[PDB]
Structure 1
Amino acid sequence: PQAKYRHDYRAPDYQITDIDLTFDLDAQKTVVTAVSQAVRHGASDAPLRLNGEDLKLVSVHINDEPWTAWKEEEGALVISNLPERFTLKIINEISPAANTALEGLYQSGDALCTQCEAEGFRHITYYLDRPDVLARFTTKIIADKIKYPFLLSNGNRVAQGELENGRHWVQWQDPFPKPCYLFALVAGDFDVLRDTFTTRSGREVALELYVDRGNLDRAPWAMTSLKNSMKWDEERFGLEYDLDIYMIVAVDFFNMGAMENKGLNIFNSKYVLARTDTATDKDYLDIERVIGHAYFHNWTGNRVTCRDWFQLSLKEGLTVFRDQEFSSDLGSRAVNRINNVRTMRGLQFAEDASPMAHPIRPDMVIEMNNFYTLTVYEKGAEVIRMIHTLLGEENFQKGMQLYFERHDGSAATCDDFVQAMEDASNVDLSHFRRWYSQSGTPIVTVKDDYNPETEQYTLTISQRTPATPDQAEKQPLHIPFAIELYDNEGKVIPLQKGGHPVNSVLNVTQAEQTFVFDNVYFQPVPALLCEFSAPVKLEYKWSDQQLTFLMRHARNDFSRWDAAQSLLATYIKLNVARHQQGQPLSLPVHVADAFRAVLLDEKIDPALAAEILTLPSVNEMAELFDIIDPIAIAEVREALTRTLATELADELLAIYNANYQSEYRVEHEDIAKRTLRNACLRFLAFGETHLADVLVSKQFHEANNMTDALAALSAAVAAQLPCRDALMQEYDDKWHQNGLVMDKWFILQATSPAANVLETVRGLLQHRSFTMSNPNRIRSLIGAFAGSNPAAFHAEDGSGYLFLVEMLTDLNSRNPQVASRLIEPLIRLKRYDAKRQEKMRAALEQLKGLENLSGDLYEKITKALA
């Protein structure tokens, strides 16, 4: 369609204060009756323009009068000649069973459910579908009681009835005014897990978790995580739940992960269901994080919502920041930080160099569903974490309090939030606001100097952001740049200047500046950008010895990991260059030694050891290069794995056996040891073949949990061990009837290093457990192939591109949101070599030419070809 621009925001000409919905539900034809109380604020001659998509209009009344002064345009009902106050009644029809895009009211198996964020409510009825219009909802649902015994919407059940012909109804009322993107409705038959939580101040909240019949056994962990979320929001932010009931529904057909609809969250069943033998540690920790996320939105999203969709990061940056803090408080703070930083440097940095690059507050949008992004979410959270770094926790909490005090019950902007932090804290964030408007990854370059005469250490720090496809003009940011200086014994040198302490978070606000530290009694080794204090690329000329020194002595665990990443980065680059010339891996002995030391150090948290022994993904590796050679990166990852496996064989085996655990528990210390153990297993799989096959075949068959079974099956696929096909067949035979469990298997198929992997993936389009109608299946087979198997996707013959093209040709008509996610690997063509660009550009040109090209794909394809 048309592009929308943030600078065109204007307050609406009309407001709706209250809406009274009735749904006469049927999967083929639902009848919606919508009675809205409305108020004109604009001019007497400005019509009311209601958004609407794929609605059949049955009638329109204004204060009970059949209205003649209206028309239908593309995506709208435009109503003229209105009074200043009136009751709008719309009756319209929709078809949930036809809805394959999973936006609006649609069917997930036998259940009916909604997804309204961002602009989905307009697929349900004609409305002011924009988030600065907030209204009190009342929702009456009528349905067949055999098919739809449970009828749910936001808030409290206020009314109930039985009708003739085996139909019944229920009515719901939510007292908190809300934007329509927070409306939900669910109808179906469910098992329900019921529990309670008592808030800090004494309010008893009924908790209800609705899952498909037969899954009540995969529900307790989710329930436990919801309670943990409620408690933690109380402890850390002082925020209590505000209603009497908290509902969560797990559905199998869902485009997002989870939707924070007020009092009635709707979740991808992936981020709900877990059993010891179906779900890994990471699934558990994911379920905790996503449950937390949806819950944290209750304040950062719902009680304070977004003025317009360009303000998405107001709620997402802040709510991701909150789910990261929650995971970090409850588990390992370092491991959380490490994985969030992996995602930043490996996926988000790629997005900010791509044709889809955008600031965390976008300036232009064609299809808003395209902006539910790594940038908006993860970079968003980094921006919030930077405010925290600048203010400290006490001031940050005061800013949170001021934000709620001012904006509770209304829609706000990114700028309102920054303003609350600034006013509450008395820290100036004027310059800081430039993080919201500027796209791309800044590059921070650092040079140092030690003067022994004066005992001064000088840092010369410079920054630039390169131009991005969306912005030609770039300016310097306010970069909180955290340092520590270590002496020759590993002790922290105190930071000072002119005889007074200096804060260790430097305000790097200029294109270039110099910081001078005094009483630096010994030439330091620095930890730069501590805890990834700003989302930037660091350019510093490290020696290997500086890096291994940091691995042994750095105070913060994250710095030890990060030092190690910098150590490996030099050698990854070296060996990618070697690969291109036909040369085998080269690696200095002392690099191997550094990793041996981590394996055998008995004092190191095993959580941390595991992360140091987890090599950068092919995605983190790709960001070290201007032009990406995806085949060299994959082969080098495998070769570096083989070489460390050979060098460290005896140490790896010892640590593998030492961390054996007979009991399975979902507890942070046990997860650490298991994670280290399975990191050792993965190297061992790439070692001596027989021993590998034995270890892996055995762990798979003996495992009492899916973490251990999958780590092994995954190693078997990756090293191409002899046991592979047999373990993979066993897994399929046992688990084919279970889609979430099979997703792991499809990911393994899709990411296999085998030579015929595409041929297998095509074949798996026919597999019993695959369906093009399910986003989860699609993402696990097709999406994993294109995103996570770059060597096969980028096969020289272009076969990966054409496969994706076929898939997208289907998905563009079926589910454009999923299509748009799957296209993302093809729009990175400018990172690749000429011959690859040529073939990727042709693929995009083929897709550009589809009849009924979705706006979702259109936005991306044209940016990519520009």
Structure 2
Amino acid sequence: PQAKYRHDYRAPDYQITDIDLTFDLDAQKTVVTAVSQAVRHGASDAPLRLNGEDLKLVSVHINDEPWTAWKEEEGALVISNLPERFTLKIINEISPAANTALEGLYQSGDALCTQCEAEGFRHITYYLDRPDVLARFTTKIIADKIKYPFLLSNGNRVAQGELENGRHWVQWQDPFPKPCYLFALVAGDFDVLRDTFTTRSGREVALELYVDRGNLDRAPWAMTSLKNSMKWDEERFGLEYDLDIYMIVAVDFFNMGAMENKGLNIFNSKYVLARTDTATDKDYLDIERVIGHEYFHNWTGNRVTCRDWFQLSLKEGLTVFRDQEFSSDLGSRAVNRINNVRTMRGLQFAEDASPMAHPIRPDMVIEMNNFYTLTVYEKGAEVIRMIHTLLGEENFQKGMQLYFERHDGSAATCDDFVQAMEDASNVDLSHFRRWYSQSGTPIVTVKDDYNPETEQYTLTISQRTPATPDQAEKQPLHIPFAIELYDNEGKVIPLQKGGHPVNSVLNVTQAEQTFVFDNVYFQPVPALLCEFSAPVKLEYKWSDQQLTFLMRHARNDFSRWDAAQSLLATYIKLNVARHQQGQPLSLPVHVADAFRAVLLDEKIDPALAAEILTLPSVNEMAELFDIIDPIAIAEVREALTRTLATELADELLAIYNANYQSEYRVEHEDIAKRTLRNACLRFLAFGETHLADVLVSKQFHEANNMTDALAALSAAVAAQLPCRDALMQEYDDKWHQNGLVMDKWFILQATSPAANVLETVRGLLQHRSFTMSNPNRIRSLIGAFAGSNPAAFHAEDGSGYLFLVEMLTDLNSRNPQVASRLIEPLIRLKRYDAKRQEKMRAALEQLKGLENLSGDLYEKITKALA
């Protein structure tokens, strides 16, 4: 498995301009005919090197001459002695039914569908499987009409026919040149929800959502959200859909979330199907965001694509930024920002502190499917957001416009995007570019001084990024550091110096620097790194009173939340140390009082209250520590919940009841109230047993929507309430035939605090609703155990590691992409104590020795074991 390097990019020796594909479809043996029009750009003696995996080659012709000057080698078909311009014809066979990896053309239930990103098209035919080769596709699909009445590919239908022996065919054409990773094919029997969207210039677009039979009842929200996505992109970005038909297919078997194939997106059904009894508010909002994300790729990914895979963030950072802006504009901006910061600080930072650390533009990859990461996506988006902070909306949109003017219809680079933004705005991003090439989380240290004689406030700000295993050399970044200063009534102090305004985004560009502010008439309380203005760790010696002051007075909702997180972090760290000494939780009265104040403040948005009242997750807590003690973290989190539950009991029940809603609506104010209600229920579940048991069981039985039902259920499991087992069996009895709904239940099982969780999980491998053939079930049971129950995963007996090794031993062979996601918790071994580290290393060494170890796993194991 050889590493590939960004610096080794070279333009292709050959282009393909046009490809005509024919599929004689059958689940056991599909025959692919591919007729490509090729053009040599490189040296006249260079062979054409086509990529292919697991293909049975039938024939090779060049201008209809059977060719003799070719050879197959590992991963490749190398064709020699070609003319400058020619027609290549390849016939080859593939076997969809054999494809358990779900890469290429595969079976999902009774349907046939494709996944081609990143390098899946080479599993279908021999091709230039690189995203800087852009070709015009025509696709003819021949199949059994009964089995496959719908035959879909990108674009519009150009031809159709019927054949003997019950076969029929449809031919599609997509006018826009594309890299092969955006090819899609779907064949099956579906229900179809059909609608229309008219663009702002009057183009009528046919919208078509394909779902398995009997799922139309779960389709309208996804269609609503597609329309909302299209409107928003018009309003915010000025972008309109460019084709006549927009197709989405929801499939049950899919490794990732969804896929932006031009005009024919393919979605995991998790990110499509919803009705009020099956889906929670968070499912609704995730469908919204994923529908949006894939639609936004139509411009940022498809009309402008990636020169090479190391440029992935060019489309993914920017399309995540767009999905976040879409959700934030339609819904609660602060709740969005809060949750994206929780992901950054709790999950992304862990990656950046791990053996798999990489810059948002990687330099070295073994298996590109391993680089669809929190870093490339979420840190990628933070980097785009920083450009937006530095430029402002108007200049950022001028940059977007210049980026599309220069690069529409091409495969571009991250550097191209940054150049466009610099050139449009006249903001210098030369130093800023280091964010693309440097891995790891910068640590930003802030000291302050108030001089009452001169009425000046001085911030001394330093930065450093620690080395990471991938990069021994680090340098200072251009860090946009947003501040606000508050007087003692809570009013903002104007920032100025020498008689002139100073921008509140400080440019922190050196290892150390000072910023001096004049006409500061009162000692201020600072709000620092406002709206998480750069993806960094902040070190400032906060008093508890400065933090509770911000919770009361800060102008932006995010700051109030962030101040609450800073206040809790001190006390989480205190109590983890106490747990290690066998001492009970300790929490100052004034800290509990600040959370009481949030409960009783009628002026606070409920959406923001709910988030302040949602404790940091065990992953966020782990981020606070150099060495992670997973059992201490889990138990401290429960104890902190119990303490607050006891101290705030009466207020929690008052706010619980005050936020009752008889009508269920998927509307943002209503969601906010429900999130606050259910935030209170999490604490009330740790009340006196009999009170809690009744409250939680009542909500479970009386709920008129799945948000409320699942909140109750999750509380019964988290607090090990007497009603737990009955409620859990009630749910299984009701919902066992519905795998998406059962995933919620598997997550609850896997994340249970019960002593016997591992035994329960292992027994659920045989559950009627579980199967190792379905990525969503694997994620919901096995993934949630390893990744989201770090306490049971890191059981001192080592049983959690042994369990994961067993499951990876299967998955390595079955589905290496899912295996690679699931090994992540073992690759974090150097964050744990020595005894755990030795057990985790033994597990990794077992896996390193597997027969037929996948490249996907090999990459991660060898970084981990270094």
Q: Kindly provide the CA deviation profile for residues 448-478 of structure 1, in whole angstroms up to 9, marking residues without a partner as x.
A: 0000000000000000000001000000000
| Deviation per residue, 1:251-300 (Å, 9 max, x gap) | 00001101000000000000000000000000000000000000000000
1:65-103 residue CA offsets vs partner (Å, 9 max, x unmatched): 000000000000000000000000000000000000000
Alignment of 1:178-217 (within 5 A): 178-217=178-217
**Equivalent residues in 2 for 1:15-414 (5 A)?**
15-414=15-414
Could you say what secondary structure the match of 1:445 adopts?
strand
CA–CA distance in 2 between the matches of 1:359 and 1:804? 28
Cα deviation for residue 817 of structure 1 reads 0.3
d(CA) in 1 for partners of 2:494 and 2:67? 76
User: Which secondary structure does the structure 1 equivalent of 2:721 belong to?
Assistant: coil
Structure 1 position 183, deviation (Å): 0.1
- CA deviations over 1:85-137 (Å, ceiling 9, x no partner): 00000000000000000000000000000000000000000000000000000
CA shift, 1:769, in A, is 0.2
Distance (Å, rounded) in 2 between the aligned partners of 1:521 and 1:807:
64
Equivalent residue, structure 1, for 2:618: 618
Aligned-residue offset at 1:687: 1.2
SS at match of 1:826: helix
Measured after TM superposition, the shift of residue 161 of structure 1 is 0.1
**How far apart are the structure 2 equivalents of 1:210 and 1:524?**
58
Alpha-carbon distance in 1 for matches of 2:740, 2:36: 41
Q: Give the CA deviation at 1:510.
A: 0.3
How far apart, in 2, do the equivalents of 1:505 and 1:602 lie? Answer: 31
CA distance in 2 between counterparts of 1:46 and 1:689 reads 77
SS across alignment from 2:752? coil
TM-aligned CA deviation for residue 669 of structure 1: 0.2
User: Counterparts of 1:443 and 1:682 in 2: how far apart (Å)?
Assistant: 33
Cα deviation, residue 323, structure 1 = 0.1
Q: What secondary structure sits across from 2:808 in the alignment? A: helix
| 1:548-600 deviation digits (Å, cap 9, x = unpaired) | 00000000000000000000000000000000000000000000000000000
Q: Take 2:80 and 2:506, find their aligned partners in 1: how far apart are those partners?
A: 58
2:795 corresponding residue in structure 1: 795
- 3-state DSSP class of the match of 1:206? strand
CA distance in 1: counterparts of 2:266 and 2:526, whole angstroms: 47
**Alpha-carbon distance, 1:521 to partner:** 0.8
By how many angstroms is 1:45 displaced? 1.0
User: CA shift at 1:247, angstroms?
Assistant: 0.1
Taking the aligned partners of 1:157 and 1:750, their CA distance within structure 2 comes to 46
Shift of 1:802: 0.4
Alignment map for 1:464-863 (pairs within 5 Å)? 464-863=464-863
TM-score, L = length of structure 1: 1.00
Residue aligned with 1:224, SS: helix
Please tell me the root mean square deviation across aligned C-alpha atoms, in Å.
Answer: 0.2
How far apart, CA to CA, are the structure 2 residues paired with 1:721 and 1:504? 50
Q: Secondary structure at the match of 2:805?
A: helix
1:16-46 C-alpha deviation (Å, 9 max, x unpaired)? 0000000000000000000000000011111
* Number of corresponding residues: 866
- Counterpart Cα distance in 2 of 1:43 and 1:229: 46
In structure 2, distance between residues paired with 1:9 and 1:555 = 48
In 1: Cα distance, 2:272 partner to 2:499 partner = 56
Please list the CA deviations of residues 153-202 of structure 1 after superposition, one character each: whole Å capped at 9, or x if unmatched: 00000000000000000000000000000000000000000000000000
Distance 2:256 2:169 in 1: 29
Task: Work out the CA distance in 2 between the residues paired with 1:726 and 1:306.
Answer: 52
Secondary structure, aligned partner of 1:531 = helix
String of CA shifts for 1:182-227, please: whole Å, max 9, x gaps.
0000000000000000000000000000000000000000000000
Output the CA distance in 2 between the equivalents of 1:451 and 1:687: 49
1:132-152 CA distance string (max 9 Å, x none):
000000000000000000000
Unaligned runs of 5+ in 1: none
Q: Secondary structure at the match of 1:295?
A: helix
Give the distance between the partners of 1:671 and 1:685, measured in 2 at CA: 21
Q: What SS does the aligned partner of 2:824 have?
A: coil
Distance (whole Å) between structure 2 residues aligned to residue 562 and residue 749 of structure 1: 31
CA distance in 2, matches of 1:179, 1:157: 20
1:699 aligns to what SS in structure 2? helix
- Cα displacement string for residues 319-378 of structure 1 (whole angstroms, at most 9, x for unaligned residues): 000000000000000000000000000000000000000000000000000000000000
| 2:186 match: secondary structure | strand
- What SS is found at the alignment partner of 2:827? coil
Q: 3-state DSSP class of the match of 1:492?
A: coil
Cα distance in structure 2, aligned partners of 1:851 and 1:12 = 35
2: distance between equivalents of 1:685 and 1:46?
Answer: 70
Q: C-alpha displacement at 1:670, in angstroms?
A: 0.2
Aligned counterparts of 1:84 and 1:552: Cα–Cα separation in 2: 72
- Name the SS of the counterpart of 2:432 in structure 1: coil
Deviation of 1:849 (Å)? 0.2
Shift of 1:304: 0.1
Q: CA deviation at 1:401?
A: 0.1
- CA shift for structure 1 position 662: 0.3
Aligned with 2:826: secondary structure? coil
- Partner SS state of residue 526, structure 1: strand
Distance 2:514 2:298 in 1: 44
Shift of 1:644: 0.1
- Secondary structure at the aligned position of 1:461 is classed as strand
Q: C-alpha deviations, 1:390-416, integer Å up to 9, x for none?
A: 000000000000000000000000000
Give the Cα–Cα distance (whole angstroms) in 2 for the partners of residues 363 and 23 of structure 1: 37
The residue that corresponds to 2:433 in the other structure is 433
Provide, for residues 696-725 of structure 1, a one-character-per-residue CA deviation record: whole Å limited to 9, x for no partner: 000000000000000000000000000000
Shift of 1:446: 0.2
| Partner secondary structure for residue 825 of structure 2 | coil
Q: What is the identity percentage for the equivalent residue pairs of Structure 1 and Structure 2?
A: 100
CA distance in 1, matches of 2:110, 2:686: 46
| 1: CA distance, partners of 2:744 / 2:497 | 55
SS in 1 for 2:392: helix
1:541 deviates by 0.2
Alignment partners' CA distance in 2, 1:469 and 1:724: 44
Supply the distance in 1 between the matched residues of 2:617 and 2:393 (Cα, whole angstroms). 33
Counterpart CA distance in 2 for 1:188 and 1:345 is 42
The CA distance in 2 between the partners of 1:455 and 1:52, in whole Å, is 70
